[PDB]
Amino acid sequence: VDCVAAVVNNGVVLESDVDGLMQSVKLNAAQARQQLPDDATLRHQIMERLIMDQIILQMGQKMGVKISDEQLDQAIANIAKNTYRNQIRKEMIISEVRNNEVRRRITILPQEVESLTELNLSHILIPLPENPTSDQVNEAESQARAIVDQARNGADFGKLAIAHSADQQALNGGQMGWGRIQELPGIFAQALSTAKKGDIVGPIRSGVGFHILKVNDLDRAYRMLMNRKFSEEAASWMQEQRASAYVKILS
Amino acid sequence: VKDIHFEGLQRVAVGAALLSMPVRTGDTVNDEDISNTIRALFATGNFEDVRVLRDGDTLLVQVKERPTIASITFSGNKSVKDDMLKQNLEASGVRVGESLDRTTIADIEKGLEDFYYSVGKYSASVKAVVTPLPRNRVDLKLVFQEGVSAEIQQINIVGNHAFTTDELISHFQLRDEVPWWNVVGDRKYQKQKLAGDLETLRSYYLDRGYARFNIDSTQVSLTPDKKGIYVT
Amino acid sequence: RYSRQVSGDEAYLEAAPLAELHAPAGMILPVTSGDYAIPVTNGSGAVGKALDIRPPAQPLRTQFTGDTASLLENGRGNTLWPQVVSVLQAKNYTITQRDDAGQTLTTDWVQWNRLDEDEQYRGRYQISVKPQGYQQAVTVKLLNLEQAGKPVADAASMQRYSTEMMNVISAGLD
Amino acid sequence: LFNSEEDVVKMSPLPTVENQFTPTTAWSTSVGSGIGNFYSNLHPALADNVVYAADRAGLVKALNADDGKEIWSVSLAEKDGWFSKEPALLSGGVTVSGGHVYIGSEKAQVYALNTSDGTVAWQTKVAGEALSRPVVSDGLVLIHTSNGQLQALNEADGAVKWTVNLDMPSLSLRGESAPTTAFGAAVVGGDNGRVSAVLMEQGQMIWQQRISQATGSTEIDRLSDVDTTPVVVNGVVFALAYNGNLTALDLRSGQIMWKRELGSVNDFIVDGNRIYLVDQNDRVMALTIDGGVTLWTQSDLLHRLLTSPVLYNGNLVVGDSEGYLHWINVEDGRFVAQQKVDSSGFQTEPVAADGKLLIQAKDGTVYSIT
Amino acid sequence: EVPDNPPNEIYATAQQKLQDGNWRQAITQLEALDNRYPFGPYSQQVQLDLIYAYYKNADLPLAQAAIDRFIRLNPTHPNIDYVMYMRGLTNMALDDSALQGFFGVDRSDRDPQHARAAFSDFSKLVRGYPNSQYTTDATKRLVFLKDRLAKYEYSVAEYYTERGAWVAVVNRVEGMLRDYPDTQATRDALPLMENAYRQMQMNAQAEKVAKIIAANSS
């Protein structure tokens, strides 16, 4: 019964693809000791993930020039130490157009106009549209307060990150690896000043949505700025692309 | 493959339906192949809902047909004619007797907004209503809201030391103000009337031996209110 | 009648024939433009009220090449002959004298077409022999002399009508 | 009368009041009539504890502050033309410099007056009709006419020191843009859609930058002109078009950093690190300046025909065409109070030179809000 | 008004109402189903029926519009000779008033602009399709049109004789000779030519035209 889960412009949102997504995320959580969240809203989260995948796929797949595959074989061989191989290529082609389009929007001045440690931190996104259609910000603030409080109280992290986030890293708990104070968006200098490893960090106001940050751990300048820039402009671009779209639930 | 047949083919040619999808008969059937051919069903876009269902008996496919337009109506178009709107939708590939593209609805509305951009109704809103009909058809209600159109605030000729401004404005076609006791015209700016008015003004000066007189320029300005128009 | 004839005016038939102007000796006639020039064609055309001004019946495999009614790509073409027999037993309720099935050759009897327009009953017999031309099992009808009002009239226009009755019905159901 | 022939347009309803603290009208002093249903930028001036205002008729009022006392008034109407009673037709916003005031008219004549006595300094002919408020700097004054000609007049006596030609498309909006000065350079935005920085004292243009979207879905409308006043701070220039591109760049002919798809004609305010503005369609947005990323947005009211917002004692204040005036919290965009202060309506930009707020009613008189 | 019904029964009632002879509701339902389904296989036959219907009811301008539309959409339809013939027939029959034929006055000198166009259409038919069902009738009608045009030309020349503008009558009879040297009108009008040449004493050609007349006296 692989029916269509949603109507998304031209293509469709199917059931086998969400099945594959659930299988992959749950097996990875089993391997990586990440708590397996209850499939009450996990179904809808995976469905939303696939829907945004399809919309970002329609914007760009029809354009550009696909990608080669031998480099994919080499990369997966390195990462090792025909159903599976299909999803391996799609995440590269979807990121290729994503990596390209965000660069086109943002322009870069020479770094010398900007004059001149690594930390592990997680991120959670509350999807707020261009304007609160149902005044979501009103409830958004209440949910943000509740969830940051629960994070303080000592709840597990995979469940909270999975619960109702929106970004692509959210599946794996939303950890962004090691970052320094100057690869993070220009709104978290005060947040990193007023933070510590493992304590509470208040939610932050933003156009895209509030963000929950948990301190999980503790030539260059071009990438120093590029990381955080890329962050904010890619987030804004994906939000705007999602908003200007036609998606209908089917069930 | 033993048996293949499609539902809801009231107007659909079976030959096209079988030829579009890859598998026909006599090939292996598994989940990835059936999913791929389901994707290939929407390849033309001529469908709205096609799906595969789990059965131990042969094969069966559910299909829902795209509605085709039966008629179009334009209720709410006080100051314009229905037939021109019909021609406009004719040009935009929305000819009556075609599949109703629900995706394009916003573009259709916006195109009609640009159509009222010409007349002078700028704060207008058009809404679409979709009514299904038997035989799986569709009728369209086009609701038009022509709110308020542009109005000339004042005509301002500048630079003159022979004739007062009113003595000059009195002999144009477009008006900035009308007597309160009389109703014979409105301040409905038209792009064509500007050139005629400039010709009139040029004649008015030049007929009394102001030979060197010429226009420095003309200026039409819109207030960011879509109700006031200024002319200099 | 006002159904199958030109407008009531008929005074053009008695048109005086054209007498070409001879050229006297010593001089010739001027050049002709040829914009109003009358050619010569074959006769045997219905004139006056006799001409049948009625739109032609376009068949609706729909062979329309005169008597040629050989409709042919469906692999179940054999069962179309009993399917045509359904049209005979039911529908028109007509019958066939020598209706071969293995040879797929049916000799349907002469029918009686009468659909308004003061039309005398038309008796048309067809050769319903089903070929296999350029496709799977085809079916063909080959008409013959048709009685109608007269003993037999086989005008070009009426032949298109007589074939059409079967062409409409046979395509209509089968 | 013709409003009956047309069906009423759609307007967003008013939000909740919850007036936490209620200021009032400090004084309802009267300044002639109002500008009515004419679009003009004629805000009054605050100068050394007195106020200066005018009206389209030509009346100009100098009034005492802190009370509705009228120090003096002058009828600046035309008294020497074809009838010696012609309408003055004043539109240029008031300007103060030293003991002198500069006023602009939609009649190509700019008037300088002397303060404290009502005496007329002089009058000067300027190309095109003046609509932008004069800007005074370096013993000079600059005016942007709605003809495409930036013009400079000598401060001391009035003289055409230089002009700069600008490009004008066909159906541009009002050419109401006031250039601003920084380090001997005047920066402005024309109706072409391109901003320009120009060296003073000779008219030598320094650089020009294109700030506009694509050609739009069509050519009709989709106007790309810029009229909001560019803002220079920390050597950084901010400009904003009609369909709009938030263009921030470096003063030393420096190039753009970021662009965003927001347009407006109402001026924005830059304070500390925050940008505060109300755009076209009348939604209020607050952003940053390190990257210009959006901080928050509010669209509870929509198409309510606001004014240019103004900061005041910690929170923003915005007018309305209806006469409502709203207080916006600096954080979250929460309301503080809704003041039905006047029924005529608010059109012209406010002034907050001191801790005292003064605002002009479009069809009425000025009002002081505490 | 008319419900959206399958093309089957709407065409069936079209056929049977047309066979009945009632034409108002016939054209009504034809135009209705023509507007509704401008894609069905009926379209060719629908329009071929509608042209006949417009002709029979004398809605001739609309018949000409529809016939131009039909010619435009398929210029090489297998049975276009019929529609061309109908074009000529409508165009000719549009030149009748049905009252001057009551009283017997012949309309041979009224506005001959429809006659010319009908002639062009019939000539085009006979040129292209000399082996179709509409040959002899076309030839007879075309002879009639040629004689009518000749009659009009002779009428104008005769009036200019009464007025006494002999250059004009000379030119008109010369045009007769070049364009219709086959009808009775030119044979009758040659004496007007000889009279004209004798009037300006350009008689040197008067005897030439005199031989022209005399040679075919019998």
DSSP assigned state of B96: S
Bridge pairing between strands D194-199 and D205-210? antiparallel
Of A68, A145, A118, A153, the closest CA to residue A224 belongs to A118
Query: Please, which chains are in contact with A (at least 3 CB pairs closer than 8 A)?
Result: B, D
Q: What does each C-alpha distance from D268 to D14, D284, E73 come to in angstroms?
A: 23, 10, 61
Q: Are B23 and B37 in contact (CB under 8 A)?
A: yes
Task: List the beta strands (DSSP E) in A100-210.
Answer: 119-125, 175-179
Cα distance between residue B206 and residue D269, in whole Å: 50
Cα distance between residue E42 and residue E29, in whole Å: 13
Distance of CA D240 to the CA centre of its chain: 14
Question: Among all chains, which residue has been given the structure tokens 């970052």?
Answer: A179
Query: Residue type for D33, please?
Result: S
Do chain B and chain A touch with ≥3 beta carbon pairs under 8 Å? yes
In sequence order, what are the beta bridge partners of D335? Answer: D328
Chain E partners of C42 at a C-beta cutoff of 8 Å? 130-131, 135
Question: Within an 8 Å CB–CB cutoff, is residue A9 touching chain B?
Answer: yes
How many Cα atoms are found within 13 Å in the side-chain-facing hemisphere of A88? Answer: 16
Question: Among all chains, which residue has been given the structure tokens 């948990």?
Answer: A214
Q: How many CB atoms lie within 10 A of CB D67?
A: 11
Query: What are the two backbone dihedrals, phi and then psi, of residue D54, each rounded to the nearest 5 degrees?
Result: -155, 180
- Give SS3 for E65: helix
Q: Burial level of C149, CB count in 10 A (0-12/13-18/19+)?
A: exposed
Record the tokens describing residue A159, joined without a space: 């469940």
Record the tokens describing residue E105, joined without a space: 């006055």
Cα distance between residue D299 and residue D279, in whole Å: 10
Partner-chain contact D297 A186, CB within 8 Å: no
Query: Residue type for E2, please?
Result: V
Specify the long-range contacts of residues D121-126, CB closer than 8 Å, at least 24 apart.
D121/D158, D122/D157, D122/D158, D123/D158, D124/D153, D124/D158, D124/D159, D124/D160, D126/D151, D126/D153, D126/D160
Bridge pairing between strands B220-222 and B228-231? antiparallel
Among chain B residues, the shortest Cα distance to E39 is held by B97
- Give SS3 for A164: helix
- Give SS3 for D24: coil
Bridge pairing between strands B228-231 and B151-155? parallel
Record the tokens describing residue C92, joined without a space: 């028109």
Partner-chain contact D221 B117, CB within 8 Å: yes
Which of C5, C12, C62, C154 to substitute to test the interface with E, most E CBs within 10 Å? C12
Q: Burial level of D211, CB count in 10 A (0-12/13-18/19+)?
A: buried
Task: List the beta strands (DSSP E) in chain B.
Answer: 47-52, 61-65, 68-73, 124-133, 137-146, 151-155, 220-222, 228-231
Q: CB-CB: which of D7, D38, D218 is closest to B147?
A: D7
Q: Are B102 and B127 in contact (CB under 8 A)?
A: no
Q: Are D226 and D190 in contact (CB under 8 A)?
A: yes
Torsion sign, CA atoms D302, D306, D310, D315: negative
**Cβ within 8 Å of residue E117, ≥6 positions away:** E91
Chain E partners of C161 at a C-beta cutoff of 8 Å? none
How many Cα atoms are found within 13 Å in the side-chain-facing hemisphere of C11? Answer: 10
Cα distance between residue E84 and residue E125, in whole Å: 7
Bridge pairing between strands D59-64 and D310-312? unpaired
Cα distance between residue A227 and residue A212, in whole Å: 19
Which of C33, C58, C61, C159 to substitute to test the interface with E, most E CBs within 10 Å? C58
Cα distance between residue D154 and residue D185, in whole Å: 16
Query: Residue type for C4, please?
Result: R
Of D340, D334, D348, D336, the closest CA to residue D322 belongs to D340
Write out the DSSP string of E176-189.
HHHH-TTSHHHHHH
* Alpha-carbon Rg for chain D in angstroms: 20
Q: Are A27 and B54 in contact (CB under 8 A)?
A: no
Q: Are D43 and D59 in contact (CB under 8 A)?
A: no
Q: Burial level of D95, CB count in 10 A (0-12/13-18/19+)?
A: buried
Q: What does each C-alpha distance from A1 to A4, A244, B27, B48, B173 come to in angstroms?
A: 9, 30, 20, 17, 71
Q: What does each C-alpha distance from E41 to A201, B171, C167, E44, E66 come to in angstroms?
A: 71, 61, 15, 7, 18
- Give SS3 for D181: strand
Write out the DSSP string of E72-102.
HH-TT-TTHHHHHHHHHHHHHHTT--SSTTT
Q: What does each C-alpha distance from C4 to A151, C19, C51, E54 come to in angstroms?
A: 92, 34, 8, 14
Cα distance between residue C169 and residue C172, in whole Å: 5
**Cβ within 8 Å of residue D310, ≥6 positions away:** D269, D316, D317, D318, D349, D350, D351, D352, D357
Cα distance between residue D265 and residue D267, in whole Å: 6
Nearest 5°: the CA angle E91, E93, E95 is: 85
Cα distance between residue E50 and residue E54, in whole Å: 6
Q: Are B23 and B35 in contact (CB under 8 A)?
A: no
Tell me the residues of chain E between 30 and 49 that have a Cβ less than 8 Å away from chain B: 35-39
- Give SS3 for E70: helix
Q: Burial level of E195, CB count in 10 A (0-12/13-18/19+)?
A: middle
Write out the DSSP string of D325-367.
EEEE-TTTT-EEEEEE--SS-B-S--B-SSSSEEEEBSSS-EE
Q: What does each C-alpha distance from D10 to B146, D323, E56 come to in angstroms?
A: 11, 18, 55
Which spans in D193-312 are helix H?
Answer: none
Helix (H) or strand (E) run with residue B16 in it: helix B14-20
The contact set of A with D (CB < 8 A) is: 106-107, 109, 113, 130-131, 185-187, 205-207, 229, 232, 236
Q: Are D317 and D328 in contact (CB under 8 A)?
A: yes
Record the tokens describing residue A13, joined without a space: 């949102």
Helix (H) or strand (E) run with residue C38 in it: none
B120 Rama sector, left if φ>0, alpha if ψ -120 to 50, beta otherwise: left
What's the maximum distance between 2 C-alpha atoms anywhere in chain E?
Answer: 80
Q: Are D109 and D123 in contact (CB under 8 A)?
A: yes
Partner-chain contact B31 A16, CB within 8 Å: yes
- Give SS3 for E196: helix
Determine the distance in angstroms separating the CA of D266 from the nearest CA of chain A, rounded to an integer. 20
Question: Within an 8 Å CB–CB cutoff, is residue E49 touching chain C?
Answer: yes
Write out the DSSP string of C62-126.
---BTTB--B---TTHHHHHHHHHHHHHTTT---BSS--SSS-EE-BPP--B--STTPPPB---B
* Alpha-carbon Rg for chain B in angstroms: 30
Cα distance between residue B138 and residue B65, in whole Å: 12
No. of helices (H) and no. of strands (E), chain C: 2, 2
CA dihedral A22, A28, A30, A31 (to 10 degrees): 160
Cα distance between residue A148 and residue A160, in whole Å: 10
Chain A partners of B34 at a C-beta cutoff of 8 Å? 2
Record the tokens describing residue A152, joined without a space: 């303080």
Domains and CATH numbers, chain E: 1-218 (1.25.40.10)
Query: Residue type for D89, please?
Result: L
Cα distance between residue D158 and residue A118, in whole Å: 63
Q: CB-CB: which of B149, B158, B225 is closest to D129?
A: B158
CA dihedral D56, D57, D59, D63 (to 10 degrees): -40
How many Cα atoms are found within 13 Å in the side-chain-facing hemisphere of A90? Answer: 13
Of E75, E67, E129, E73, the closest CA to residue E94 belongs to E67
Determine the distance in angstroms separating the CA of B100 from the nearest CA of chain E, rounded to an integer. 15
Q: How many CB atoms lie within 10 A of CB D264?
A: 25
Partner-chain contact A207 D250, CB within 8 Å: no
Q: How many CB atoms lie within 10 A of CB B155?
A: 20
Distance of CA A241 to the CA centre of its chain: 14
In sequence order, what are the beta bridge partners of B140? Answer: B72, B130
Cα distance between residue B20 and residue D369, in whole Å: 72
Q: CB-CB: which of C21, C39, C47 is closest to E137?
A: C47
Question: Within an 8 Å CB–CB cutoff, is residue A249 touching chain B?
Answer: no
Q: How many CB atoms lie within 10 A of CB D357?
A: 20
Bridge pairing between strands D274-278 and C105-106? unpaired
